[PDB]
Each structure stands twice: as structure tokens, then as C-alpha cells.
């Protein structure tokens, strides 16, 4: 069981959207629920993402499939992106991570 993140990184256009597509695979559990993180150089945390606005999700569910769109990227949105899915309420995995370049 792991999550395929792609892409890995990625460098974009000031204005551009970024799309990050994740998979849960090699399970026979089911897509419980998503979450995304971002993490700049500056941070030893990641913050977690509220969805709204900019932020825009997708879950499918019977694919085990979901993915995050960031609209109108400026040069702040440049961090690390990590989307997680669980398997469960107790239970999670995570992709590998995008690196993003946000151009001014």
C-alpha cells in the first residue's frame, strides 16, 4: 500500500494552475477521506491546506483516485505539497511529494 503523487515537481507561470494527481494503490482498502499539505524552506511543519477558493479538490473514490488544483499561482505558492489518503479512520498514506517553482 502507498500513494503515487505526481508529478514530483513541477515549475509554473505566475496566473498558471497546478494540478497534482494522486492514487491509493496496492490495497484492497477503499479511499476513506483526503488531506493536503504544503511545507516551504522556511518550515519544519507542513501546514495543512483549506480547500476553498484557489483551492480546489477532486475524490474519486471507486478509482481511489483524488487531486488538488492550485488557480492563479503566485511566487509564495513555491513550497512542497503532500497529499495523503486513508485507508481509514486510523489509517493513512502519503505521496512523495510536488515540488513546486511558482515563476514572478
Given at each position: 500500500?502507498?500513494?503515487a503523487?505526481?508529478?514530483?515537481?513541477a515549475?509554473?507561470?505566475?496566473?498558471?494552475?497546478?494540478?497534482?494527481?494522486?492514487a491509493l494503490?496496492?490495497?484492497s482498502?477503499g479511499?476513506?477521506?483526503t488531506?493536503w499539505?504544503?511545507?516551504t524552506?522556511?518550515?519544519?511543519r507542513?501546514?495543512?491546506?483549506?480547500?476553498?477558493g484557489?483551492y480546489?479538490?477532486?475524490?474519486n473514490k471507486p478509482?481511489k483516485?483524488?487531486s488538488?488544483q492550485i488557480?492563479?499561482?503566485?511566487?509564495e505558492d513555491?513550497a512542497?505539497y503532500?497529499?495523503?489518503?486513508?485507508v481509514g479512520?486510523r489509517?493513512?498514506?502519503?505521496?512523495?511529494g510536488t515540488k513546486?517553482?511558482?515563476?514572478?
Open positions: 500500500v502507498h500513494v503523487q505526481t508529478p514530483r515537481s515549475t509554473k507561470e505566475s496566473g498558471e494552475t497546478l494540478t497534482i494527481n494522486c494503490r496496492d490495497t482498502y479511499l476513506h477521506s488531506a499539505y504544503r511545507q524552506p522556511g518550515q519544519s507542513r501546514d495543512q491546506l483549506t480547500i476553498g484557489r480546489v479538490k477532486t475524490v478509482q483516485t483524488f488538488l488557480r492563479n499561482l503566485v511566487v513555491t512542497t503532500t497529499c495523503r489518503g486513508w479512520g489509517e493513512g498514506y502519503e505521496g512523495a513546486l517553482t511558482v515563476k514572478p
